[PDB]
Amino acid sequence: NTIRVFLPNKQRTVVNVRNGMSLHDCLMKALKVRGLQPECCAVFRLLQEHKGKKARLDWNTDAASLIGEELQVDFL
């Protein structure tokens, strides 16, 4: 039961997001671990069978419910 949040540039990371670990907690962590920032980084959900572009995502979704899929983040 874990979600796969891909770091910026092109990385695949996944951690335990139970209880209600919103994207703000999982991202603010890997975000401070690298010394980045939310004002410059944006969240994106895996392309749910669309044209060819990542889908947007709010900054408060529940990762404990999105587990199984993979979230992505880059510089907006």
Swiss-Prot record:
State where the protein is found: Cytoplasm; Cell membrane; Mitochondrion; Nucleus
According to the UniProt record, which cysteines are disulfide-bonded? none
Q: How is it modified after translation?
A: Methylated in response to EGF treatment. This modification leads to destabilization of the protein, possibly through proteasomal degradation.
Residue ranges annotated for the RBD domain, each copy included: 1-76
Q: What does this protein do?
A: Serine/threonine-protein kinase that acts as a regulatory link between the membrane-associated Ras GTPases and the MAPK/ERK cascade, and this critical regulatory link functions as a switch determining cell fate decisions including proliferation, differentiation, apoptosis, survival and oncogenic transformation. RAF1 activation initiates a mitogen-activated protein kinase (MAPK) cascade that comprises a sequential phosphorylation of the dual-specific MAPK kinases (MAP2K1/MEK1 and MAP2K2/MEK2) and the extracellular signal-regulated kinases (MAPK3/ERK1 and MAPK1/ERK2).
Describe the family membership recorded for this protein in Swiss-Prot or TrEMBL: Belongs to the protein kinase superfamily. TKL Ser/Thr protein kinase family. RAF subfamily.
Subunit notes for this chain?
A: Monomer. Homodimer. Heterodimerizes with BRAF and this heterodimer possesses a highly increased kinase activity compared to the respective homodimers or monomers. Heterodimerization is mitogen-regulated and enhanced by 14-3-3 proteins. MAPK1/ERK2 activation can induce a negative feedback that promotes the dissociation of the heterodimer. Forms a multiprotein complex with Ras (M-Ras/MRAS), SHOC2 and protein phosphatase 1 (PPP1CA, PPP1CB and PPP1CC). Interacts with LZTR1. Interacts with Ras proteins; the interaction is antagonized by RIN1. Weakly interacts with RIT1.
Q: What is this protein called?
A: RAF proto-oncogene serine/threonine-protein kinase
Lineage at the top is: Eukaryota, Metazoa, Chordata, Craniata, Vertebrata
